[PDB]
Amino acid sequence: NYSYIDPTQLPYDHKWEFPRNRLSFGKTLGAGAFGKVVEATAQGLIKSDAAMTVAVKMLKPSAHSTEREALMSELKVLSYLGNHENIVNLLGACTHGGPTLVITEYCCYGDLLNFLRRKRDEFVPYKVAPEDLYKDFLTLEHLLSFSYQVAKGMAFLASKNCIHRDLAARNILLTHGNITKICDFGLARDIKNDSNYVDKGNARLPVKWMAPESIFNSVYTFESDVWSYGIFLWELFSLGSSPYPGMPVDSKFYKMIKEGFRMSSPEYAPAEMYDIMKTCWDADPDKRPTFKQIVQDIEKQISES
Ligand SMILES: Cc1ccc(C(=O)Nc2ccc(CN3CCN(C)CC3)c(C(F)(F)F)c2)cc1C#Cc1cnc2cccnn12
Ligand SMILES: [Cl-]
Ligand SMILES: [Cl-]
Ligand SMILES: [Cl-]
Ligand SMILES: [Cl-]
C-alpha cells in the first residue's frame, strides 16, 4: 500500500500525544463500514485554557486487526508529512489508554465535491457585481485557485515520496477563505455503497479516477496521481459532475480507456486548464507533467487572468 515510503520504520513523534479525556465528541462528519470522523472539542490543545473545535478519526467496533494497523499506519504517515498549507493539518493523537484517535483541524465548509454541487446553480464565470459580494457565489477565479492549491499540495506529497492513490474532489476539504486541504477519508467513507467506487477483484476502487497502469498493473507512482488530478480538474470545471457521465465501469470502459478515449472538456473549463487535463491523461506516464510543472502552469494562468 506504500509505493516508496515505509511507515513501519517511520516513528510516531510523541509530541503529538493528547489526553483522551480532554476530547468531547459531537456529531459524525462521515462514516464507513469500519471507521468514522467525528467533530469534537479539545480542552487543552491551545496553550491558554480555551477549548477549540477539532475533527477526530477513529475506528468502529466492527473493525478488525487490518483496520487497526491501517489507522496507526495513517497516523505515522501524517506525522511523517508534518504540517503543510495545502494539506489537512494533524493536531494530535491518542495512542495509549484506548483505541487510536487521530486529531486534525476542523474545516468548516466540508468536502469540495458537495460544495461544488451546492454552489453549482449560482456559479458566475466573470466578475461578481460588486453589490453581490455578500452572496459568496462560486466563480471561475475560485476554481482556478482550487486547482492551484491542490496541485501545490500534491507537489509536496510527491516531494515526500508519498502517493495519495485516491485524489478526487470528495477527498478535498474546504476551509474559510476558499482554502483547500487535501485529505484522505479512507475508512471513514462508505465505499461499499458509494457508486464512485467500483468492484474490481476483491477490492472496491475509484476506477474512473485511476490511471491505466494502476488499473491493469496495480502500479502507483507520482505520475498515476497526476492522472487522478486530471480527472479532479474535470470534476472541478464541470461543477461537481461525475466523470465519464453515463458510462458504467465495465468491459467497454476498460477497452475505451486502453484505446485512448478521453473525456471532452467540461462546460466551464478554460482551454489552458483542459490542455492540462489532456497531458495528465497521456497513456505514457513519462509524457505526463509533474505536479510541480502543473503549479507553474496554473500560476501563469492566474497572473494573466
Ligand atoms: C479526523 C481526520 C483524520 C485524518 C484525515 C486525513 O485526511 N488523513 C490522511 C491520511 C493519509 C493521507 C495521505 N496518504 C493517502 C494514502 N496513501 C496511500 C498514503 C498517503 C492524507 C493526506 F492528506 F496527505 F492526503 C490524509 C482527515 C480527518 C478529517 C477531517 C475533517 C475536518 N473537517 C471536516 C469536515 C467534514 C469532514 N471531515 N472533516
Ligand atoms: Cl484502534
Ligand atoms: Cl505513500
Ligand atoms: Cl469559503
Ligand atoms: Cl482540444
From Swiss-Prot:
Q: Which residues form the active site?
A: 166
Q: Which ranges make up the Cytoplasmic topological domains here?
A: 1-305
Extra remark beyond the main annotation: Numerous proteins are phosphorylated in response to KIT signaling, but it is not evident to determine which are directly phosphorylated by KIT under in vivo conditions.
Q: What induces it?
A: Up-regulated by cis-retinoic acid in neuroblastoma cell lines.
* Amino acids binding Mg(2+): 2, 171, 184
Region annotated Important for interaction with phosphotyrosine-binding proteins, chain positions? 2-4
Q: What is this protein called?
A: Mast/stem cell growth factor receptor Kit
What does the UniProt record report as the effect of altering residue 190 to Y in this chain? In MASTSYS and MASTC; also found in acute myeloid leukemia and a germ cell tumor of the testis; somatic mutation; constitutively activated
Q: Where is the Protein kinase domain?
A: 23-305
Assigned protein family? Belongs to the protein kinase superfamily. Tyr protein kinase family. CSF-1/PDGF receptor subfamily.
Mutation: residue 5 to A; reported impact is: Reduction in SH2B2/APS binding. Abolishes SH2B2/APS binding
Q: Which disease is it linked to?
A: Piebald trait: Autosomal dominant genetic developmental abnormality of pigmentation characterized by congenital patches of white skin and hair that lack melanocytes. Gastrointestinal stromal tumor: Common mesenchymal neoplasms arising in the gastrointestinal tract, most often in the stomach. They are histologically, immunohistochemically, and genetically different from typical leiomyomas, leiomyosarcomas, and schwannomas. Most GISTs are composed of a fairly uniform population of spindle-shaped cells. Some tumors are dominated by epithelioid cells or contain a mixture of spindle and epithelioid morphologies. Primary GISTs in the gastrointestinal tract commonly metastasize in the omentum and mesenteries, often as multiple nodules.
The observed outcome of changing residue 57 to M is:
Stronger interaction with MPDZ
Q: What is the lineage of its organism?
A: Eukaryota, Metazoa, Chordata, Craniata, Vertebrata
Q: Which residues carry this modification: Phosphoserine?
A: 195, 265
